[PDB]
């Protein structure tokens, strides 16, 4: 979700911006074959 819609629809920036809006996270990217927005 959050832009991570598989290896043909992998919007890392959308995920990153989603993750950065959550207190305590620095960023994010698509993981698990493009299907998971992973925040860090």
Swiss-Prot record:
Similarity section: Belongs to the invertebrate defensin family. Type 2 subfamily.
Region annotated Binds to membrane interface, chain positions: 6-9, 31-37
Localization, UniProt: Secreted; Host cell membrane
Protein known as: Fungal defensin plectasin
GO biological process per UniProt: defense response to bacterium
Keyword Metal-binding set for record: no
Any further remark recorded for this protein: In mice infected by S.pneumoniae, it has an efficacy comparable to vancomycin in the peritoneal model and to penicillin in the pneumonia model.
Keywords, comma-separated and alphabetical: Antibiotic, Antimicrobial, Cleavage on pair of basic residues, Defensin, Disulfide bond, Host cell membrane, Host membrane, Ion channel impairing toxin, Membrane, Pharmaceutical, Potassium channel impairing toxin, Secreted, Signal, Toxin, Voltage-gated potassium channel impairing toxin
Regions crossing the membrane: none
Organism: Pseudoplectania nigrella (Ebony cup)
Domain of life: Eukaryota
Residues reported to bind beta-D-GlcNAc-(1->4)-Mur2Ac(oyl-L-Ala-gamma-D-Glu-L-Lys-D-Ala-D-Ala)-di-trans,octa-cis-undecaprenyl diphosphate: 2-4, 12, 18, 29, 31, 33, 37-38
Chain's role: Antimicrobial peptide that potently acts against several species of Gram-positive bacteria. It selectively inhibits peptidoglycan biosynthesis through complex formation with the cell wall precursor lipid II (1:1 molar ratio) thus inhibiting cell wall synthesis. It does not disrupt cell membranes. Is especially active against numerous clinical isolates of S.pneumoniae, including all 90 different serotypes and isolates resistant to clinically used antibiotics. In vitro, shows considerable selectivity for bacteria over mammalian cells.
Effect annotated for changing residue 31 to C/D/E/F/H/I/K/L/M/N/P/Q/R/S/T/V/W/Y: Complete loss of antibacterial activity
